Structure formats: structure tokens, C-alpha cells
Amino acid sequence: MISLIAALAVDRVIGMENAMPWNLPADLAWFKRNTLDKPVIMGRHTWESIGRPLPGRKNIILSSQPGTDDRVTWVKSVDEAIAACGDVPEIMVIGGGRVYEQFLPKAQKLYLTHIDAEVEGDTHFPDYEPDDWESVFSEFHDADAQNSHSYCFEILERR
Template structure:
């Protein structure tokens, strides 16, 4: 099972605004890239806070939300039956289950707590990171809660527009 982390950050390394968290600051090109790739993959995994910021499941994708209290979301899960699932499964068992369901790749879409959880278990194979040419008053970075050192290799740099770039990294073998 391949895990691709897909995130966007400002040039000062932040992934979320402190104030007015729903104010858009990423480019249309990044949004189109994110939508295209995650729809092709078919399943996204995120944390509860990320889901709450988005406010609803992403269309045409299986949305899996990691939370310590999945039972609190049973009613919401039923509202979006078949596209939204809340779970407290460990990352390894979740990935095994998804693989048995026929998925070959998953998109990990944050936040920093979930990113760190998967990274520290050596489960992230690739990172697609868009760098937007903005400086924002943010409170979180891509891996705010990571301990240790993890090596990735830059495989590709794509210009999304005149100012934003997409960096594609791959996990170093043996790490």
C-alpha cells in the first residue's frame, strides 16, 4: 500500500492560518492538482481537526477521519453513508484493511498530528508539497509534532503557475 502525503504550505512553512482559518490562501492550480490527484487515488485519510476545517466529505472520494472518539460521529457518518468514515484504527491496520478493499494507494491530507503519526511509523512513501508564494500568520507546519529524522529524495519540481511550485519527494530506501 502506497501512502502519498499531499499538502500545501506558505513560504514561511505554515499550513494553516491562525485567524480566519477558512480564508483561502492557496492557488487555484494547487486546488485543481489536489482534487485531480485525490480523485484518481479514490481515498483520503485525515485527522478530525482537518475534517472539521473542511466541514464536509470531499466529493467522489472515500473520506476516512482518524479520531479518538469515532462513536461521536455515527450520525454524521450515516448522513454521508458510503463516503465518510470515522475510525480510531491504528495506521497499519487501517492501511491493511483498505488494501483488502482493493485500494493500492491512499492520499494522506493532514493535519500535522496525523502526518507525524504516519511518518513515525515509516508509512509515508511520497510527499507532494505545494509551496505557495505567501507569508501567513500560521500556527502549524507540515510536521509540527515529529520526533527524529527522516530522509526523502526530491524527484520532481513542477511549476503550477508563475509563482507556486509543486515538489514531489520519495522516501529514501532503508529509512
Template sequence: MQLVSVAALAENRAIGRDGEVPWPHIEADVRQYRERVAGSPVILGRRTFDSMLDDLPGSRQIVVSRSVDSVDVPTAVVADGVDSALERAEEIVADGDDSDDDTDSDDAVYVLGGGAIYELFQPHLDRMVLSHVTGSYDGDTFYPAWDRDEWTVAAETAYDRFTLREWVRSGDAA
């Protein structure tokens, strides 16, 4: 299983303000993000899950929460922490019901936030696919800092208003 963080972040690592992104809408970023995670399981926090209920990302959702035991969505399960979320992700990948051909990797599981979830899963990541948005923005939620010596940019694509970078963890420190 490959654990991959997906996020859009400003130059100051801001990812959110009052539950929304702090910059004006970037359609190309939303499109590439949705296409990337469409056929794969995703891990996200309860508040992020609740904010996406009208248009859930991914084929299966693993909701990390200590305050709820279940959610009323057939494709979603609740995990009470990192270890149980990773176990659920391994089970889903092993079941093989999420092997669409349009994903980067047949065994990718995507971490989608929010800020505390990114922080909790950071030590476990194999890759990060980050949309680096041009400019700094006021925010109340930030993507965690990472040691750039532990990561290498494997791919980079420039778009209008953001650059998409795929970071790969160097060595076996995942």
C-alpha cells in the same frame, strides 16, 4: 498500497491559521489537489474532515479520531489511530472499488492533514506531494519537518505563487 501525503506549505512550513490556509487563495493549487485525490481514499483528522463536509475530497474518507466512533457520511469510516487507519486503507485498496484511471497510482491513499495527522503518518509515507507556496506566513499549524537525506525530489512543476514537488522516500525506510 502507496501512502502519499498531500499538502500546501509556506517556506516556513505553515499550513494553516485559524482553520484556513494563511495565504491568499491559489486556484491552480486547489484544482491540482482536487484532481489528484478525486478517485482515491483519503486519511484525515476529524477537524479537517468537519471543515470539508460541504465538499469532501477523495472517493472514501478515513477519519482519524479518538473522540468519535462514527460519522454520518456514507463514504466515511472512523479509525482510532494510525494502525487502524492503515488497516482500513489496505482494505479499501484491496476491495478495488477506488481504481479510477485518473490517479497517479491505482493503490494510492492520500493523507490530507491536519498538522497532527501529518506528523503521525510521516514515518509511514512512501511519497509526499507538496505545494511549496512562495513566502512565509503566520500560522498556528505547520507541516512536520522531514530529513531531506531520506527523500528525493522525483518531479517538480513551477506554477504562479507555488512549486509542486513530488518527494519519494529513498531506500526501504518507509
């Protein structure tokens, strides 16, 4: 089973010039927790911006080009990336936009962080049919001294 995890601002904005604008530590803890010990699939731009493998997870990078770092597993097709994960109970797709669009139709769950921030970006999360998804978990939070924006964690499962 494939799951997508992403943080979205107003207008499904997910990124700006290969960077996430805001500073949401509650979000990092959420991501960590949901990704720990699972394989993660990400696109080459996302890889570049992270620069080092995420620890305690098999890191699969999708690129048309030959890989350039032996610390991670390079694949060149969606199907290849799924096959590389083996038979685990859940695969985490972590971005970016081009990647999420592609995994979407195959995904069974979404973990989203809705952030109350207004920012401009060059990338947006894919527009999904809300009728196909059921919201099974949702917890809202007010900004705090650590988190400068309010946010809501949400979990959706395909019907």
C-alpha cells in the same frame, strides 16, 4: 503505499486557525487531481473545516471519539485507518498537522505545493529529513491573475 499531500507556505506553515489563508486555485486543481478516486485519511479538525465528504473518494476520519456522521468512515488509530482503505494502490493522507506527523514515517511519497506566501499560522508541516527523500518532480509557476502567489509543485519519493 501511503502518500501525503499538503500545501506549505514560508516556514512550513500549513494552517491558521483551521483555515488555509491564501487563494490558490492552481493548488485546488492539483489536489483534486492527485486525490481523485483514492481513499483519503484526514484528522477530525480537518474534517470539520471541510464539512462535506470529498466526492469520488473513500473518506476516513481519525478521531478518538465515536463518529458523528454516517457519510464517512471513522477510525481510531493509525493502523485502523490503513486497514480501512483495503488493498488500494495508494492512500492519500490529507492533513492536518497532527495527522501528517503520524503518517510521515509510514509514507513513501509526498506531494507538496510550496507557496511563496508569508503568513502566520498555528500549524506547521512536519520537519522531515531531506536526505531520506528524492525530488522526482518539480514545476515552478509565477503568480497570475488567478493565483496571487508564486508556487511550485513538487513530488518526493522516499529513498
